[PDB]
Amino acid sequence: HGSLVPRGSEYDYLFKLLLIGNSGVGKSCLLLRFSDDTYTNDYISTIGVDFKIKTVELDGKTVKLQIWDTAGQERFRTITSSYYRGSHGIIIVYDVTDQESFNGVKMWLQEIDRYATSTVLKLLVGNKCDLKDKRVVEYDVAKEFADANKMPFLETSALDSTNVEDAFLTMARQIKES
Ligand SMILES: Nc1nc2c(ncn2[C@@H]2O[C@H](COP(=O)(O)OP(=O)(O)NP(=O)(O)O)[C@@H](O)[C@H]2O)c(=O)[nH]1
Ligand SMILES: [Mg+2]
C-alpha cells in the first residue's frame, strides 16, 4: 500500500558511451565540461576506466548517458574487449594540435573494429580547437577521414565549451535514432 508509480527497468533509455583516444587529447576534460560544466589546466592521467552519468532531454524524452572515460596511457589501461562490445556508441578523441594523436585514430578505429559490434555508433572528435595558434590537423583532412569511415565529426574545446554539448548530444541522438 498504496500508490503505484509506473516504472521500467534500470537500463531503460540508458545509453552507454565510450571515450577513447591517446593520452593528453582531452577525454577527461571533455567529460568534465559536459557533466559538471567545469575544467582544469591540470593533466591528471586517467587510470583504468571510470564513468559519469549525465541526464539529458532528447525530443521531450529523458535519457541517461553513461559515459566511460578511459586511460590513454598504455601502462594504465584496464579496458577489455567487453567495454567495446558493451557500448552503444564510441567517441574517438584526438588533439588538433597533435599530429601523433590523429595518426592514432586509425589504430583506435581498428580496436573498435576488433572488439565492438559491426553496428556500433561512432563519432570523431578533434579537441583543443581553442588552440587555433597550434593547429597541425586541418579540419578538411580529419573531415575526409571521418567521411570515408562513415562517421560524424566535430571539433571541440573542453577549455572554452565549443561544441562539447553538441558532440555528446550528437552521439546520444545517433543511439536514440537507432
Ligand atoms: N587548450 C586546451 N587544453 C585542453 C583541452 N582539453 C584538455 N586540455 C588539457 O590537456 C591536458 C590533457 O587533458 P586530459 O583531459 O587529462 O586528457 P586525457 O585524454 O583525459 N588524458 P589521459 O588519457 O592520459 O587521461 C590537460 O592539461 C588539459 O587541461 C582543450 O579543449 N583545450
Ligand atoms: Mg583522462
Curated annotation (Swiss-Prot):
Record-listed Phosphoserine modification sites: S178
Keywords for the protein's UniProt record, in alphabetical order: Acetylation, Autophagy, Cytoplasm, Endoplasmic reticulum, ER-Golgi transport, Golgi apparatus, GTP-binding, Isopeptide bond, Lipoprotein, Membrane, Nucleotide-binding, Palmitate, Phosphoprotein, Prenylation, Protein transport, Transport, Ubl conjugation
A GO MF label: SNARE binding
Source species: Saccharomyces cerevisiae (strain ATCC 204508 / S288c)
Binding, GTP: 23-29, 39-46, 72, 127-130, 158-159
Covalently lipidated residues, kind S-palmitoyl cysteine: C29, C129
Region (Interaction with GDI1) residue spans: 69-86
Protein name: GTP-binding protein YPT1
Modifications the protein undergoes after translation, according to the UniProt entry: Prenylation is required for interaction with GDI1 and YIP1.
Any single biological process term in GO: retrograde vesicle-mediated transport, Golgi to endoplasmic reticulum
Complete-protein stretch covered: 3 to 172 of 206
